[PDB]
């Protein structure tokens, strides 16, 4: 029946986030978080292998067959780019494919508050975009980087596994290195990045202690560094970074973070109240002198109280404060807002007042 | 006399849990926990090798002869699936085979309380199914996963060594990866699972620090994660997870567990008082705000007191409370209930209270 | 002169425990702990090599010649089984051989108290048989396992280096794996033993931290686990197990031990007062609720006081209490009892009262 080109076109046309191909099921697309099967016969092992192999190079095929795992990205001219993962289950090939649009949407289209636009103007520091899997983090990062590319005459370097969004040069020089092709690893790229005269660097996830140290060094040496974590809040993000280090070296890490941290964004995507589309809920922490002191004084938990009152001055916003605003504008239902609040009793109190 | 197909048929027909093949003994089938020898001549070394090799591929035969060890699963069309272990003792092949039915029983048939069915509706978090060896853990997990498969339109990924229960697609997309064939290892499968757009993940036993960290990460990144441990209670399960980490990092592990933990099930299978069959005894801990606080404040022991009074509100149940109910229903004898109670004095108090 | 078959027959016939073959000495047999030379010419290097090689397979000969060390067991039909060790000294082969009877003696013949028979009825837990080298530990373990084999319909697995006592099936299924032939190592056997549906497992000596963790896991997962240590008392045994772990993880180990421990037996073999044969002296600790609390409370030393008064209720017995009974029945002399008491002044006090 349908070939890979038609399946990916249907994924794009229907606003799906992921296309799933596996044996004994028809192709399925995730729309607004939920899977929907396409009106097609179920695939067999011949189908899944042929469809997934149709978008691989010969080197990628040999590589997938050596490990039964493969991450990759590819483009279909005139349609979209895609991030693919291919694996093996029950002795057969399976694949998942995520849409990466060629055109980056704006801050207001993505539902990002104006403070996120101001983060794109920071000359230096560490900006963290956090949240659960598939919560819009790469899309937010692409919007920020596109703004920098538009407005600055600086050098942007990204290190990606794989490269997702493409950034053609506007006013910046943008260099994008793909792990496994352009560079051997994140570690090898970071070993030479300081000799490449960067101004803005995207390093991906802060996956281990070595990557955290690289990001802290980048942010301390006069660069604007963007990174991601899978944490769910500003406080949880700061604690996660500090606590990976041995107890005797955590004082320095807290001091470094207090100096270089310029923003923490924690995102989630919620189903809209209408039943179509998803809306962004975001917690924003922008450090002020009080928050930087709390970090140095090892009073990280008290940062949440500072965020509750930093709305007008610094554009800060707790997750519950964002859910409150989404509820008053009727963008989400009460069940969705409550089922997502990190503290439902606090959000209840905010409602009853 | 009998061939492997006939021996596995008797295993299934008799409701046994395991078939044992070893030299100088007839085939034996474990029924309700106790071995029963079949009315057959004892096997010799030729018999044990031939019977076990009849259910192996040539690649599996080569690997078994390379290591004198082998785990595997296989199916017999129209009968059942089986998990097998082949080994060598006294210079001869030996084998044990566990039944894996094609049909997944319901919560009611398995003796699982209604709170277990509500765990299958959880959209995120960490659910732990614990207990001793052969206590029904994989069967409970299959029942929960079959319920999710029936009710949700989500992506379920399992990593198994080997794959036991097979889950055909219902309303979910179900991908099942077998270690050693589909994926190199648990570690390699977990290295890529976040790029496979999952909603529900089965990771197997929390074998080491690395697997615990993977399961905690899965649970906090928006997924429903199922895993097993060989601990015997909810409190012992929480302590086991925290205590594997260095002392300075246990605070973060306790904070993570307090956020993501959605359920701990600890099971044991007991012989029925009727003499035929076994009955499930299960301790259920479902975190409420009080328990999550106790985890963060490093007061894990005080969780047991919360479970004693959380029956009506949250469906919680200590093991002794489950044993009490089984005794009231006359499913088990007093000796069996007392002999398996983790605190016989408490169960005695509960019985002679009124 | 005499061949290996005749030397091993003389070892069996004279009730010896070990036969020694080395150059410039006649064959010597250990009877009741003391060596006695046989009335034969001294052996040379040709003799020792020929005698020891007569009981080796070709693979064992190549193996011994590669390492100058070899542990093994073998049987002589109609006579006995034997555990052998072959080594090299002064450029020549030497060998020691221990008798392993085909018929396992009963509890009363071995001098084991009735509480040891009750340990064979335990459904689950950890049972430790401890004592110095050659103190009867394997023989006690074989008697317990034979009782389980007789009375239960369960699965017994032993891991041995090498297999000593053979256990033909009675009511149990008994599988015995020899390290270096049936299984690669203790570690590899223990890696798969939980997938082999065992009920009772013999794991040998708790030689390292990894083996202790395996035994604690077996005893906690619904199995009856038997293991040995070379400790001399119940308290010394418990302390040895806990103290091998780092200080931060000892709380869990004490908690595990308090849950799974079902018995500690510490044996010694003493020469009989008549001058012929040896008699077993044994310290028995069976945990009661008080002892299990002392383990959790890190009050291990106070367990000895509980054993002094647990004779009638739980069948417990300190080593000195056993020596006291052996002295009143005139089984041992005062010098032997005192020369063996771990606290001679306590045994003195028990005598003068
Ligand atoms: N602000 C947003 N509002 C609504 N939908 C969004 C938003 N941002 C991203 N999405 C959609 O969510 C899906 C995931 O996008 P994206 O890959 O950028 O997030 P992610 O956290 O980086 O995913 P992953 O964890 O796999 O790397 C996409 O389909 C995207 O169109
Ligand atoms: N609720 C139950 N009630 C009665 N019997 C059960 C129940 N659950 C499982 N069993 C039976 O117990 C035996 C073991 O089942 P299962 O393999 O699922 O447990 P397990 O703990 O995962 O075993 P293992 O430790 O080897 O992985 C099977 O024969 C099964 O039919
Ligand atoms: N209860 C007993 N009474 C008298 N003699 C015994 C008793 N048990 C064992 N023996 C004898 O002591 C000798 C050693 O026996 P055994 O090998 O079982 O002890 P062991 O501690 O396991 O030795 P090793 O440390 O070398 O492994 C044998 O000759 C045996 O016959
Ligand atoms: Mg991304
Ligand atoms: Mg299982
Ligand atoms: Mg021994």
Author numbering:
A (entry chain A), C (entry chain A): 1 to 353
B (entry chain B): 1 to 354
The authors write:
PilT is the PilT/VirB11-like ATPase that powers T4aP depolymerisation. PilB is the ATPase that powers pilin polymerization in the T4aP. T4aP polymers can be rapidly depolymerized at the base, resulting in fiber retraction. Adjacent packing units adopt one of two conformations: open (O) or closed (C).
In the crystal, two nearly identical C6 symmetric hexamers could be identified. Compared with the interfaces of PilBGm, all six interfaces in these hexamers are closed. Density consistent with Mg2+ and surprisingly for an active ATPase ATP could be modeled in the active sites. In addition, two ethylene glycol molecules from the cryoprotectant solution could be modeled in each packing-unit interface. As these crystals formed only when the pH was less than or equal to 6.5, we hypothesised that PilTGm may not have ATPase activity at acidic pH. When we assayed PilTGm ATPase activity over a broad range of pH values, we could not measure ATPase activity below pH 6.5.
